[PDB]
């Protein structure tokens, strides 16, 4: 009966000089403060984001998992580490380094800390090879971003990557990143509050409305971060549009709502009413507890929303433990 | 029991020659064949959008307004005719003609057909003037886009406009508009399924998080089309960000969910569970029935979702009739 948190991030102890070998301007590295409890992710000499010790220190993180009652945590790259815009070979070298750091991180306690790998998604062949290598080395799966430039998950290269993972039984976490919006939402974390949930919805609907689920084998295990964004709530509008407009029907032979049996979401929706709607749509078997630890906005009391919701008790057990154990093959 | 549909659209019987004298390539106009059961919207010479014989032709619309149960319908400009792109004075002239066209459309039966006006929002002074003129001419309020051609949608200019309307007791309908994802979302009406609900959420949160509601008189009567987009579902996440991040509180002194009393939304969410959540969040007094008639993706059975819901009887009557009666002053 382990409590499993399946959505968390880490960041490796990369030096500025090491990151500079890759890209002096866009390779992230970690600056740690003099007393070592806090620090910053950096890009070149630029500050990118304030972080604290649990992000990079596995001993310290374990102490916090104990205090939250978390038995097993699955953790993966912070998305700034993805490097999807880099030259493909350099990005492949980088993913392999990051993936080794991840394994070093988990080696502190591989029974309680599990890792997912990143891949150089901009090159299909290298991405597939790294997926297979990383999992063979001990990763439980892969986390990828939800798009590559103007390429959404319906794109043939991404669908091909997902098919490779399906065929090799490699679970996938899709994480929103590099949000759309452009110039008009700089303040008040609007990209996180508006663009992020729409990115995730868009990734899900791209697979659905392109007919990708008809082509990708049922063995694919794929989870979308952050509750599937606004997917669950806007699904009604999607089924209606499918029903009453031909161009929505063109590549998708069944009503969109039925494809919920082909994917998973985590539970980070920050409201009991929202979570009850999510589970209504997805089913209790397809929602997994995820917290976004250890980021500032990443659930204070992990599992707290799920326990306080009016969901049935067996649903609560599935979401907290059952579904993730099966999805990531955690014994 | 009355039945008021406050979300619908019309397009005037403009000719090719009239539109050309504004802009022969950018001023939309209506082409009806010979047998007047079909018709089509043109942008110049090219075809913009095929269209139903109810968008124009009020007599037909009344027949369809009797077919369901719609006693009164509020109708307003198709977004195509906004001209927010155009030069200010030419847009001022254009909104004038469109608004007069509107009254002439409602002239068929002013008791059952009410109109809202459009304004030249790219110029504050001209916008206020047309808002005032159009209302004194019989318009029940104003429809604006959440946006402005291809624009950044939060500033003091439009805050200025909202205050004018509140002090003149002119109701406002905010209507989602030209999408954000640029070169993405080319297929399956993804712009309407993803970007539009996100645009509406963005309009709402930009008001809230800018602290605009702290300086706009409480007399403001404002409503957001299509359920407020994904606002209701994602409000948990927005409250979480406000509570845990300094930059989200910079200009907004109360939690964001506190401001639901400063605005209204329509009920167009096409799903029972989504409607219940929307109602839980906004209150029975702040949701109004709207159908998006006569567009293909409008509600098939106008009011069907609300009526077949498990909401209170008082709730059903406010949503279906009471709230709009008060909002638009309709008897
Ligand atoms: Mg392309
Ligand atoms: Zn995350
Ligand atoms: Zn509309």
């Amino acid at each position: 009966k382990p409590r499993i948190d399946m959505h968390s991030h880490f960041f490796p102890r990369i030096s500025e000089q090491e990151a500079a070998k890759f890209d002096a301007n866009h390779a992230p590295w970690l600056q740690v403060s003099a007393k070592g409890d806090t620090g910053s992710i950096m890009m070149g000499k630029n500050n990118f984001r304030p972080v604290y010790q649990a992000l990079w220190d596995p001993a310290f993180r374990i102490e916090e998992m104990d205090a939250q009652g978390v038995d097993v945590q699955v953790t993966c790259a912070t998305p700034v580490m993805f490097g999807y815009t880099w030259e493909a070979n350099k990005a492949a070298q980088w993913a392999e380094r990051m993936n080794d750091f991840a394994l070093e991180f988990a080696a502190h306690n591989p029974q309680r800390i599990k890792v997912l790998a990143q891949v150089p998604l901009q090159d299909l062949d290298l991405a597939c090879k790294e997926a297979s290598r990383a999992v063979a080395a001990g990763h439980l799966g892969i986390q990828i971003g939800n798009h590559l430039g103007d390429k959404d998950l319906d794109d043939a290269t991404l669908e091909a990557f997902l098919t490779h993972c399906a065929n090799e039984d490699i679970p996938i976490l899709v994480h929103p990143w590099d949000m759309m919006g452009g110039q008009r939402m700089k303040k008040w974390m609007l990209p996180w509050l508006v663009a992020m949930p729409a990115e995730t919805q868009l990734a899900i609907l791209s697979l659905i409305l392109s007919g990708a689920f008809e082509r990708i084998p049922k063995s694919l295990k794929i989870c979308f971060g952050h509750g599937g964004g606004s997917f669950a709530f806007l699904l009604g509008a999607v089924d209606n549009a499918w029903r009453h407009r031909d161009i929505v029907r063109e590549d998708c032979p069944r009503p969109p709502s039925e494809y919920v049996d082909r994917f998973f979401v985590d539970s980070a929706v920050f409201n009991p009413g929202a979570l009850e709607l999510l589970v209504s749509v997805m089913g209790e078997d397809r929602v997994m507890l995820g917290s976004d630890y250890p980021f500032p906005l990443g659930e204070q009391k992990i599992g707290g929303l799920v326990l306080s919701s009016n969901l049935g008790e067996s649903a609560k057990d599935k979401i907290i433990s059952g579904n993730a154990s099966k999805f990531f093959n955690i014994n």
Side-chain angles (χ1 to χ4, degrees), chain A residues 7 9 175 226 292:
Chain A
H7 183 166
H9 300 281
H175 194 292
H226 301 283
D292 219 15

Side-chain angles (χ1 to χ4, degrees), chain A residues 7-9 76-79 143 173 175-176 192 225-226 266 291-293 295:
Chain A
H7 183 166
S8 78
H9 300 281
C76 49
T78 302
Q143 167 192 230
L173 176 57
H175 194 292
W192 201 244
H226 301 283
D266 75 35
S291 67
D292 219 15
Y293 179 94
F295 288 123

Side-chain angles (χ1 to χ4, degrees), chain A residues 87-110:
Chain A
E87 185 271 315
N89 288 302
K90 175 195 294 188
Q93 292 174 35
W94 174 261
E96 177 169 9
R97 183 75 165 114
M98 294 309 104
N99 288 340
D100 291 342
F101 275 122
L103 290 174
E104 287 184 13
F105 185 87
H108 175 75
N109 191 329

Side-chain angles (χ1 to χ4, degrees), chain A residues 156-269:
Chain A
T157 297
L158 300 186
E159 178 189 326
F161 177 72
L162 301 189
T163 303
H164 169 83
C165 295
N167 294 330
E168 292 217 12
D169 294 291
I170 292 172
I172 301 183
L173 176 57
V174 180
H175 194 292
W177 99 296
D178 181 29
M179 264 58 74
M180 77 187 63
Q183 198 74 10
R184 35 184 305 221
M185 308 146 59
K186 20 248 299 299
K187 214 44 244 156
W188 319 298
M189 300 191 60
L190 285 167
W192 201 244
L193 303 165
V194 176
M196 184 274 283
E199 284 286 357
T200 302
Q201 184 200 10
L202 175 54
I204 292 160
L205 296 184
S206 290
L207 285 179
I208 290 178
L209 301 175
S210 69
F213 279 128
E214 300 296 326
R215 298 182 292 272
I216 299 167
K218 192 263 190 304
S219 61
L220 174 66
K221 287 167 150 192
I222 186 165
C223 185
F224 290 88
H226 301 283
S230 40
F231 171 74
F233 186 77
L234 299 172
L235 185 51
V238 183
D239 269 10
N240 179 76
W242 185 85
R243 233 118 207 167
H244 306 297
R245 297 290 254 101
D246 300 277
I247 68 190
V248 186
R249 265 174 271 181
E250 228 153 39
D251 300 312
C252 176
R254 283 173 286 170
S257 58
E258 296 185 7
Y259 292 92
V260 300
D261 78 322
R262 295 296 309 273
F263 61 97
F264 292 69
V265 300
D266 75 35
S267 62
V269 289

Side-chain angles (χ1 to χ4, degrees), chain A residues 52-55 57-65 108 293:
Chain A
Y52 81 96
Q53 204 184 7
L55 190 65
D57 187 340
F60 184 91
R61 167 176 311 215
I62 284 283
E63 274 200 305
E64 291 198 331
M65 288 167 58
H108 175 75
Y293 179 94

Side-chain angles (χ1 to χ4, degrees), chain A residues 128-168:
Chain A
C128 295
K129 286 180 162 81
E130 184 57 29
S132 301
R133 188 204 70 90
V135 174
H139 286 260
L140 295 197
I142 311 296
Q143 167 192 230
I144 59 160
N146 73 293
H147 69 108
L148 207 66
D150 51 31
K151 289 195 224 300
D152 280 288
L153 285 188
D154 68 290
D155 189 271
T157 297
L158 300 186
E159 178 189 326
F161 177 72
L162 301 189
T163 303
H164 169 83
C165 295
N167 294 330
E168 292 217 12

